[PDB]
Design a protein around this nucleic acid. Sequence first.
RNA 1: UGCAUGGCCGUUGGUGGUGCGUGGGUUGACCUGUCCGUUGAUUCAGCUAACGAGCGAGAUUAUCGCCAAUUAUUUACUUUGCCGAAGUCCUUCGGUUAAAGUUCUAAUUGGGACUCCCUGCGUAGCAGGUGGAAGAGGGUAGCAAUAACAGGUCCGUGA
Lengths: 305, 118
Amino acid sequence: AHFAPRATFVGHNAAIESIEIDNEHNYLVSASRDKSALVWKLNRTQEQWATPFTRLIGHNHFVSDVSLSRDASHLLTSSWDSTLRLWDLSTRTTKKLFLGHKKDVLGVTFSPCNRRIISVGRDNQVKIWNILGENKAELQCSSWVTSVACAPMADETSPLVIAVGCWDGKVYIWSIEKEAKLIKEFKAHDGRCTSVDFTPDGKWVITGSDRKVVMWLTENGAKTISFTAPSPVHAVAACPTQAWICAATYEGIAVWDIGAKQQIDLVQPNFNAGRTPDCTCLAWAADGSVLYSGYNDGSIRAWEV
Amino acid sequence: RIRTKTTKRAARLVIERFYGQLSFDFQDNKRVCDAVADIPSKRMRNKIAGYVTHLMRRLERGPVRGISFKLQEQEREKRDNWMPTTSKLNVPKILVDPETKEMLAAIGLGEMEGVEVF
RNA sequence: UGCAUGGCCGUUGGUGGUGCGUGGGUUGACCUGUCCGUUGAUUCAGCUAACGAGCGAGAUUAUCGCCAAUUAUUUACUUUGCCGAAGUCCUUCGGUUAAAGUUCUAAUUGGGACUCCCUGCGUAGCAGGUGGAAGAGGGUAGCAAUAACAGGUCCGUGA
């Protein structure tokens, strides 16, 4: 069902590229184009939802992507600067930078179990670092790489699956174990492949330039279903708990119910010859309570079902 | 602060070839025009990308003069080719003015079965 | 002897200008190309017996301003620790191949600003505003077309 405006809150002057939330609740971090990445903390008390907790001043360009420990201690973040930065959560202060990656770095994730840092950008390689900070594996691809995501859980032994979405069109999926052998490679999108996320269970995967959100299979490949968005969508992210999938267009956020197989809702809040704000990222909380979305003027808006 | 003939004539030639890339945002397209075209300086690409962005939010609108970007060339061909069912040239009574009926006498083709005057 | 000359320089004028290939107009000098808005600008936009290549303008070079990587314990400093002098319970000085560095200092490689963003006005662009170290060529210089002045210098020269 549809959901009302809970709270806008702002502390961030340029746009927001990405956004992520630490485990359970409290503490979300909005990576910002300003080159400064905040962390908040959530009161959820009437008028103010959150207030800002730290600022991470260190990079010399926009901060692309931001990724978090299971503890919510030792978060990592990357920029076009061509480096990454581990930042102690409590005292800020960079712990160690990363050096090796040539061009602007667009995508970061951890594993589930704090094992392998997965940086990626426009040198056409997914680097796999150690948590120590030294380069283990150097996987390869045709074009630039916008986005990555990691399969949940796996209990250590299971291969930890890495979906990737490219600038040319293609969508790579990889195993790890040790050597990292790609399960499948496919021409997932017609032109540009913007953003990639997993289904929580991880049978399926999500990618989608040509106004088409397409789910695919984790093993081996080929499509389950193809939807059609109204106008071209920048970020995609499935709900944790319930069977939803959601997609940040210009016109709103297109809320597919996956079984019923249709857009139930489209939520933009109200505000000649101007663009007016796009939404460039989504973030479901870990409970599936609340939906945060980061915006192009420099704001974040919360909605709760 | 006008854009010169070289940076315009580049920026149109970029959108010719690579409309499959690019966006409304500047900071993306700046980083494209390094890879797409070898450019000597930094200031050049910021002014090229600055017009490449300008043309994108003109293109979100009716088709710009003196530019052709391959997706619309495909789309024009479909929009061109098809032609609606029926001639659309049959009234079929066909009204005709009083003097123009007297012309159709003089040719030698009155009693045509096409109606007269008013 | 600069009114015999070379080079170099000032100036007309650092203004926005200058003129080729093929085509057309004219007997011809010659013209067209090189023409209703915009820009510091023959700057762009578009008209159109012209279409296409130039040179100058722009780009580029140099520096000033803001960034963080890369180095520096005998050519710059800082913090902490030692040993001094005063204060005389914690404050200030001076010294130190002694441990960690880089905010000041020094200088290389890159990042950064584009009318991108919003609102008015009129596609080219213009005015204001937010943010921003910096906003409208970011500031200041350097370089600077063709065509000439009987301007200057035979007291610069083994011109």
